[PDB]
Amino acid sequence: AWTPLEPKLITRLADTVRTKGLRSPITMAEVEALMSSPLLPHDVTNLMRVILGPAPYALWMDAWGVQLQTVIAAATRDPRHPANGQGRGERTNLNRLKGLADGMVGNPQGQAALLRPGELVAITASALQAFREVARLAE
Amino acid sequence: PWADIMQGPSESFVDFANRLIKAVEGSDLPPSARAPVIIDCFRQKSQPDIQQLIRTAPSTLTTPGEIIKYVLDRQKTA
Amino acid sequence: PWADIMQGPSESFVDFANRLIKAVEGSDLPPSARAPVIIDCFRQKSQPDIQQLIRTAPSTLTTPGEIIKYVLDRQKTA
Amino acid sequence: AWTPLEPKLITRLADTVRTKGLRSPITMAEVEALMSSPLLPHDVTNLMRVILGPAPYALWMDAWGVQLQTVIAAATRDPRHPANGQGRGERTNLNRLKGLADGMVGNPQGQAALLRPGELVAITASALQAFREVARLAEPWADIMQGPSESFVDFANRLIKAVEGSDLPPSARAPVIIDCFRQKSQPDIQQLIRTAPSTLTTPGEIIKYVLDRQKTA
Amino acid sequence: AWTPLEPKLITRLADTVRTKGLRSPITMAEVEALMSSPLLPHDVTNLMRVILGPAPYALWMDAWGVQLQTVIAAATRDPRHPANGQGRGERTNLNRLKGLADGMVGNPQGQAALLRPGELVAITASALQAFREVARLAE
Amino acid sequence: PWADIMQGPSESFVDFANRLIKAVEGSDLPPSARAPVIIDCFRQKSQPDIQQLIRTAPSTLTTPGEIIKYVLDRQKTA
Amino acid sequence: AWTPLEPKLITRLADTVRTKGLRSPITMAEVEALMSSPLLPHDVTNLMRVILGPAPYALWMDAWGVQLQTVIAAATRDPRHPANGQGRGERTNLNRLKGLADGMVGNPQGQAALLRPGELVAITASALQAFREVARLAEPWADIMQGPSESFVDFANRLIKAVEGSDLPPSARAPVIIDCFRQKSQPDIQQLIRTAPSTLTTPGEIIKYVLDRQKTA
Amino acid sequence: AWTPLEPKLITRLADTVRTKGLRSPITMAEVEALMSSPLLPHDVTNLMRVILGPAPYALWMDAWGVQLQTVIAAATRDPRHPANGQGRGERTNLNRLKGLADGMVGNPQGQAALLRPGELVAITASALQAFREVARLAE
């Protein structure tokens, strides 16, 4: 069952990003805090939509896609990925990682249903690395 | 109005990009027409120093984020 | 001391590069840390005209030789 | 059966040569147009008599003879020339090429009778090359500078014209045009080309880059 | 059999380009008119040599080469190109498109002999797109 | 009259050649006597600088076109 | 057995590079002299460390690596390289060329033991080409005119120097030198070259002709 | 086995040519000294590249070619040339004399391998005569 993040925590994090900036160690610590439980693509996408401005959000979408592509290359380079399965029918496509696959587009409940925990942690680590890249790039 | 936005002589580039993306996304354009418009407004607005900086890009920039990153890297510190 | 080397207002760039590479290679740094230090010293020393010339490089320069070649190509003849 | 060229087309071509000159690309295009069907020696000779003045006509007769002699040397160097035959009795003499052979002198009908199509096309190509030589001869790239007030497209036009209409080999025009763009083209554009983050390896690319990043004034 | 374009039409088109410029809609209409029948590389090359100045002609040679290279990439990406054939022996090289192949250099008759109609229409469309690019670039 | 044509002190050589060939071909001479007359008029008219230029020709010039080409090549640019 | 180069010769070469520069023909001749016997990677590396400054040495390391990579591409494109062998077990890796392979790092004796003579000559030619590139890079022909008072041999020396020490391809230097002799070289020599009864098709022949028939003054 | 000439001797000879000139009897004696052992085309070519300036080097290349052509004419006029052999398969082409033949271009070791001693002495005498001609011509 999907539970959304508190809008109070999200508002506090947005104001933190607004006053301290993207690169302060306190901001990265707060992001790591709100990046503790494995989030669904819907959660991370809306979180970055709210806390980041338009141009940093575009940059972050780009960087997140690139990092997820590196993850999928490593996944096709190793059939023992915690997102993959043993047979070929469990291979994870980027539509399933970005939340674009069938039964997931716009629906967080179905998303949480079909996604694997390894998928969730890989998406989360990818999003964190992308946030780091964009923060280092913006300023 | 997005089509009336110019980068001022003294304005920085991140402020101009913020203002332009705000006015383009908060307008009556379809969602699939915002990125090309933002790019082509970066290229034709954004006073001729940055215009030439974007023009002479050895790589092809196909996203507002990539253009912003490139310009922030190679901008004239002043 | 390598970290105290600045490009003088009247000094050419090849002399500055020679002096800097000499002081960095004849120092106590490990061999695997000389190239990144030379690059980051080219970027932060080397008075702001060449600083902006290196900053606005459409290509990514990942070697002191490549940076030297680029700067020698596009330098302000004077 | 021999059909003469229209005197209207010949008059228009003569006036074209009179106003534009011998070396203009429009004039060479018009000559290529009137050089489309394989012409008999009579046709080309009268055509050059009408369109060219006396001295260019003398020069053209010389050059045409030289080129035809080169053709006949290649023909004696290969018995499979489309003008030649297999046996030795079909070897083509210069009297047959210049229209001086027996049964051809002054008579275009007999000319068209005895001549081969390979003979006609060889004569035609020879005459075209001779016209090119004389045009290049009748009317300096290393002295061309971009004036202080001149635009860059005019300078590029003038330079490319003078370099392509010169005595350089065809494989040496592009490097010369590039290196003349770099050393001529007054120091603002010189520095603009020097500080090119990309490597420009063609005159067209240099022209495009300069037109993009030029100082609007 | 190869028939050359009228020098009268070419002279009128050259004067049109001289007075109206490269980008006027009347000039593009006239070029489309003289670009009606599929032209051999010799025809288009001489046409652009006559109507364009030296620097626009250099730019146009560059652009034509680039567009022909894109065409050849699409051709190696699809063996059913109207310029290609079914077997590998009919694959079309850029020497055959630019008129540089064997039996074609400087000879328009042999050119018209060996070239395909699909080759001709592809060359013609490429030249038209290159003219459009150069016209948009010159002014 | 062809036999009265001289190259003026300030006239170029192509104008003189044009005038002379015109007057010789539009005259009462037989067709087989025009080329030798044009050559011998190039040699004796065409003021003494070009006269000496034609005289000291290491090759033998046997055609008006060849003489014109030679003189145009080796003429004193002024 | 490995024998080091004399430090006396190396000191003389270093002072030559210090006074004359990297691009002088005497310096390139001296380098060719000390590049006569096939050197081991250790020898060439230490030689360039001593004769070149820090920044030219970095540039030279880069260029040497690039040229060696081109050599290894040609080697994988032809199994008959004098550095390669017939079987796949003799294929030469860049660690063996740069002296980084096993049993070679820092030891010139072991280096000389395992290396092939073809390997040595390929390394040496690569290092020479890299030195040429860096020398051309570390320090304009179309702007050279013969001064009103300058002699012709000085002008020819200056022009040939600037043309050969430039970015032109090797196959484009002679035509450019000729066409610059013809258009530069103030109008007395211009007319002297123009009125040449023979056709001059080489800079040496043009120089000889002009030196013969020049106006003694 | 090929052994290069000492760069010390070459430097001394170059400075001799620089101070005394090309035509002094001491310079010709020094050249005769360094022309004692039969040199390979590589050796003489590099020697003249180093000791002569650019324009004298061009003149010397011309003169050397002419003298070698005279030698090859005498060789085809007499099958008993010390460079030739008895059969027709040993006839010496100018590519073999100028070092342009197969297996010789740029490689002095292979050069020394395939060349004959008569070839070497003929090349050497030709180069000496060419040097004399150029020296008489330069001043």
Added chain:
Amino acid sequence: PWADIMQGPSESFVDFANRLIKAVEGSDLPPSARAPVIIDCFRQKSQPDIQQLIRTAPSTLTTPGEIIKYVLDRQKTA
């Protein structure tokens, strides 16, 4: 004395050649040394106009008769 013979400023070339050949053949030189001496005296005497005329000879003149013929052909009529 042959080595003291100069072509006067107003003297023609055939008179100078006659005088020089006379003095050289009626002297104490060996018979095999007269032609080279006559040639080298034509080249160094024979005032600088004819000197330059002989110098700029596209062909190589290897006989006094050939030099005389060439000079008589290309001489400055005056």
Added chain:
Amino acid sequence: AWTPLEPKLITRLADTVRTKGLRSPITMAEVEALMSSPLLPHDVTNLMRVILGPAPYALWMDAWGVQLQTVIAAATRDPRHPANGQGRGERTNLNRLKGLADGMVGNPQGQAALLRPGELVAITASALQAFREVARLAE
């Protein structure tokens, strides 16, 4: 048997050449007169030595050699020359025409012995044409 020309006629002809010049029609008529009987190379050579100055004599030697070479080319182009014979053993070399062959050098008697009448008339016509050339060239 060889009979020399009268020194009185030769003196009169020399004074004619001295007063009237080389090109006067009276001088050419006198030369044709003294060129009536076929002369041996010795006779014509001494005649031109006496009547011509040194420089015209050099020019005449050159021109005579050239004309004799043209004659010998025509002779090798036709085996029916009145100087030639039918077999190859009668082919006439320039040493026999210029009087340089064996048994002729300096001896007019032996000259008259071995020479053919066709040889004599060819030599005479060649000398006359050479005299005409030199006379046209001298003034």
